[model samples]
Target: LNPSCKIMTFRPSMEEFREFNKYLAYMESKGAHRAGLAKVIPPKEWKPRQCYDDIDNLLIPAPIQQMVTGQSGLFTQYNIQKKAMTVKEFRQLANSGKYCTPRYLDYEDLERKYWKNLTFVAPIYGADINGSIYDEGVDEWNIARLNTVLDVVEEECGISIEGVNTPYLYFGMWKTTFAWHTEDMDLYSINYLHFGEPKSWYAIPPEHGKRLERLAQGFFPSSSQGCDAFLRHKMTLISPSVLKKYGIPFDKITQEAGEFMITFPYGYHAGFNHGFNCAESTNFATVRWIDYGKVAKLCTCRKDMVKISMDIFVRKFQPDRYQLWKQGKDIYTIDHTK
Candidate 1:
């Protein structure tokens, strides 16, 4: 087991999300780091809609399959398997409390106490906007120092902060797994388990990124030297238990309700819900991420690319512009460059 997995956990506390600025006003209020992470947010009333009670509070667009299937976009080109059920149907399934089994719980005793099993994932920027859980009129979020700068870039681009998805809502049931991947543009990410069951996370540190890729090279017989080689193997990610079996070094941790999980820019992470759960996750890039961002824009930022939006705004993130924006200058952009 790699104790150096580079994944850190924290217990910074806060209430519901109401204002972007208020997010970590409460966190900084904590003033001390716990678990070696945030020395750390919201109204101590905003919360996730409990599946059994607040059914109407949820807003679902189309099933994931419906969103991806037959769409002539970059994401559609990936040969990954997609299966989905509607939010209402998932609510009914969760409300019925039938997914409660030994295989689902993080711990055996939790099965007796926790019973909801519905999971919903939506990118706030591109997905349907609903009244509930979608913080309206938020441009800047004070969740962490890393993200405080995210607002300046977003507002400068004239993009809606809500659509930018700093905190994408994830409503999960047992066995809902997020695949192994790095943050968009190799940036950092933060996740808070709003409430409910624990979510287990597996992390492979940055130092081992190449090693993990070497392991995957064995999986993808079709690719060898190019960028597409390791990428094609991403579609085959599975449980860390299996990964560990193959001699890939990693670490696993259980993130209970009211806990925080922070990821470095290059750490590859994958995990599944231990039981019914609600969590919010978002991506953020610091000044340090600019190098990787540049590489990403060179390789990405175009069509014929699979699994990412072509217009990721990577083209507009010039270092000079970022320096100017940091100094409170708003009269600069890609338009200015042209």
Candidate 2:
């Protein structure tokens, strides 16, 4: 673990957990599974097709409203796992107009029941352009803030957020596990956790970067279909000796609905659910920051601009988990700058 890292815990009261669990139960009943599509291009002029077989299994399109608007908060109960696709195939299919449907899982329930009701909360900007109307003010400000952070990252790390955009934000109630892959960008980032508890993470240091690179190249070509292939390959390369040498153990502290921060290298970390049951109703916020100066130094072999990406932060003020920013008798503070 990084010496600068810290883990802070704040246990919720029985009543609080009870209320939160209610939402969890609702989500689980909806058959939440990690949702993604296998992009296949049928020969000649046929527009690509998105097989919803995966999402359909997890979510039922019952009442017309639920199918169209996804109004019920039930969907918010389930979590979705984010997976990776081959760069070659993903780019090819995407360019061919073969895209994923319902790209975002509807979580109006989470927004209405948990988000809007929260006192001090705002929606993060997303890459999706054709979705519903989001809070324009918040989204624009977030972009501005992201630019500021990137500037600082370059100054501090001797790198630049070139080629890849740092701090990508996903909005809506899409509950899924993220696949194992490094950011396309050359820089690393820090994710600020807020809103709810998700799962814990595991990381490997740069020393083992070569091993992982070799493993990824070897396995990805053959095991492209199965999501578990990525995990299995990663585990295989992360031998016990490597664990003892550079592996860091950080407990997945229960999200008592508080603020937390984590710095992760571009391709050195992997995360999974604590368990299937606990994964439901797990929603959180993350902001990404790139070290511009670091990248510049690495590419040019000389330190030029010393900048640090402004800290990317996110928080939701609902079900108050001991507000660290305020002073009050009922509030409790949990340190998450780990």
Candidate 3:
């Protein structure tokens, strides 16, 4: 009754993985995108340093979600209940296993209570007036460097987009979930489990992406009535059993510490934490991503969403050079006369 595809797994050399753009290019050449997702196993002896244990702590207000299990499944209905707790307090709660549910829940009873709390979308780099856990400048992962546009757009044009180019940190405990959704602007996403128990993911390849949309719409017809990219709202969760019954193809992966998971453009991905863990994720775009970004529906799905100024990107990048090369012509036919 269970069906799943083997997510493409890559064991690239340390140098290959660290090279960033070249590694992405190599993966593309290998058709890694066909799987919808890829599990990148780092070479042996690859360990990054961390210094968080040295600092005492900082008490910050974090949202503990009051999750609801409805006809669709366990999902956040945009309801947030905040609890001001220090990282230590939250870690203590995560380690205690108080919120771990046993088996099934009564979806019909909206009154039943369960709190899903996790600290996510936190900036890794400290602000000008504050302290952050990780220093983006010295961290080995250095996610900002992975985004190709930073050099051309941010550095040269002085334009920076938070959570788009800048890396965000996630701290998860049991059953803390991110609902089914694609990355912003349809860009690629890479998530690294800095240190923690494994996180489980379910993804549908881009080819069957519409299947997921249809099923999600079926589950929440009213919500889908107006929004074209309903899943972008991150409010729906269809169980694997439901997906299998609906005949939507999907693959599962368990990402543990020292591993990286890459989600391709238009890849519908949703996942939950197995246990206490810390992970970092950021969006990046390859030259190939430009086409997807150009036609992406995210900007139109909702108002007030930050649009990726393709005009600025095109003005700065002149992506047409890639098209010319694709036609078997060089950037310029070596003008020897000049």
Best by lDDT: 3
lDDT of each candidate versus the true structure? 0.45, 0.27, 0.64
Residue lDDT tens for model 1, 1-338: 21343334333233334443344444323421111123113234433332334533455443232111121111211222233544555545444445432343335334222222212221111122222342343333323223444555565655443333344666666545455666655555777676666776767755565566676556544433444434423333444544667776676667777555766545677655654566666666544445444333222223433233322243455544555544556342221000
- The better-scoring model by TM-score among 1 and 2 is 1
Instruction: Write candidate 2's Cα lDDT for 111-162 as tens digits.
Output: 2233122122211111212211112343211222334433544455554445
Runs in model 1 deviating more than 4 A are 1-6, 12-56, 65-88, 95-98, 103-147, 157-165, 223-234, 245-247, 297-338
Query: Residue 23: error of model 1 in Å?
Result: 12
Error of 3 at 256 (Å): 0.3
Candidate 1 similarity to native, TM-score: 0.58
Model 2 Cα shift for residue 316 (angstroms) = 38
The alpha-carbon root-mean-square deviation between model 1 and the true structure, to one decimal in Å, is 10.1
TM-scores, in order shown? 0.58, 0.31, 0.78
Which 10 successive residues of model 1 have the least lDDT summed? 68-77
Itemize residue pairs with steric clashes in candidate 1: 16-46, 23-41, 27-41, 119-171, 125-163
